Design a protein around this ligand. Structure first.
Ligand SMILES: N#Cc1ccc(C(=O)Nc2ccc(F)c([C@]3(C(F)F)CCOC(N)=N3)c2)nc1
Ligand code: NA
Ligand code: NA
Length: 379
């Protein structure tokens, strides 16, 4: 409990490409690098020589592979994969000292799914069976891990942004990875990691929307998405406040829609003109909330692969949503996040590794008094 030295720094990634962990599958073990995704629930790995893949799962080499004789077709909004379901023995080298028999979707065809140039070749869906494909009888990896071992039913994530890195602590919490205290919000339903946002402020100014708009139709914590996505009506109000707060400089319209980058001369990004963003989350106790606060360092993402600039370029990484609020790597990179599945709650603390400057820091503060927090959930 509280100290897992062998798991610290076991995540890697590149800007824009997500955070992955090394895993082994099959006997003898095949090493693969696997995207950590709290927004999905399948363990799915490339299993054919797609040209973007460094490595892929070769079932024929595994003596412990068992075929489930069942295919799966998984389309998303952007991209799709198709594959064949089986089980095999799985380990995490920089994780608990255990091996489990887990479901694996061996991906045999994909479109817009793998990233050309990335170093990962599969996804580890850490959410719940309710959103597993093809249905909820396909037990997710973490469920199998907990059923089959003595690993406690929780994991925690410290995502360190810009190469990027961080830590996934499986079965516990490591107190060296955060400062101050953890504050917990209830998991409202076990499918995604769904939470309820009760108030939103831009530089301390409340947006003053009906709080149900903040969770229309849900709000989730998702390490497999870069942006903070906000329901459309909330995005419109949020951008209008951020423009107002920032208006000592003028940016093109397209910038705010994520349609154009903005660039400054290296070493002089004026962080100080941009406001902080606070989300108040429902707390553990009736009429009690806490707030998490992020900086422009989290929501203005550096874009390095800009082959027609000099020069320091950023994308605005808050975007409109049709799927509810998505607290992606923009929120998560400020905090140490604890997915305390055993107590159905999510903890937030200030991350010991978050990017900040000498004037402002990310913050997790409470308790606040907020009434009618149950009306904020959308049904
Ligand atoms: N920071 C950061 C960051 C950058 C890229 C990605 C990424 O490419 N995810 C990804 C790629 C393909 C998918 F299909 C998914 C899905 C899939 F696995 F469900 C669907 C979209 O949302 C989620 N959460 N996962 C995620 N993730 C996180
Ligand atoms: Na167990
Ligand atoms: Na600490």
């Amino acid at each position: 409990r509280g100290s897992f030295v062998e798991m610290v720094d076991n995540l890697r990634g590149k800007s824009g490409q997500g955070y992955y962990v090394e895993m082994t599958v099959g006997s003898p073990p095949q090493t693969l690098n696997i995207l950590v995704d709290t927004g999905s629930s399948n363990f799915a790995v490339g299993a054919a020589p797609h040209p973007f893949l460094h490595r892929y799962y070769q079932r024929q080499l595994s003596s412990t592979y068992r075929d489930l004789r069942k295919g799966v077709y998984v389309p998303y909004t952007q991209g799709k994969w198709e594959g064949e379901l089986g089980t095999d023995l799985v380990s995490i080298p920089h994780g608990p000292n255990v091996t489990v028999r887990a479901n694996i979707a061996a991906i045999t065809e994909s479109d817009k799914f793998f990233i050309n140039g990335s170093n990962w070749e599969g996804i580890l869906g850490l959410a719940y069976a309710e959103i597993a494909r093809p249905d909820d009888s396909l037990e997710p990896f973490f469920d199998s891990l907990v059923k089959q071992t003595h690993v406690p039913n929780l994991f925690s994530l410290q995502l360190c942004g810009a190469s990027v890195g961080g830590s996934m602590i499986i079965g516990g919490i490591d107190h060296s990875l955060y400062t101050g205290s953890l504050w917990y919000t209830p998991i409202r339903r076990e499918w995604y990691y769904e939470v309820i946002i009760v108030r939103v402020e831009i530089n301390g100014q409340d947006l003053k929307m009906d709080c149900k708009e903040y969770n229309y139709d849900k709000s989730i914590v998702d390490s497999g998405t870069t942006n903070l996505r906000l329901p459309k009506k909330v995005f419109e109000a949020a951008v209008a406040s951020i423009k107002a707060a920032s208006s000592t400089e003028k940016f093109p319209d397209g910038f705010w829609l994520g349609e154009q980058l903005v660039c400054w001369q290296a070493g002089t990004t004026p962080w100080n003109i941009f406001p902080v963003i606070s989300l108040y989350l429902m707390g553990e106790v009736t009429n009690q909330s806490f707030r998490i606060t992020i900086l422009p360092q989290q929501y203005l993402r550096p874009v390095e692969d800009v082959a027609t600039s000099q020069d320091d370029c950023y994308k605005f990484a808050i975007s409109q949503s049709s799927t509810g609020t998505v607290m992606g790597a923009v929120i998560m990179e400020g905090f140490y996040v604890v997915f305390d599945r055993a107590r159905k709650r999510i903890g937030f603390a200030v991350s010991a590794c978050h990017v900040h400057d000498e004037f402002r820091t990310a913050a997790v503060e409470g308790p606040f008094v907020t009434l009618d927090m149950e009306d904020c959930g959308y049904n």
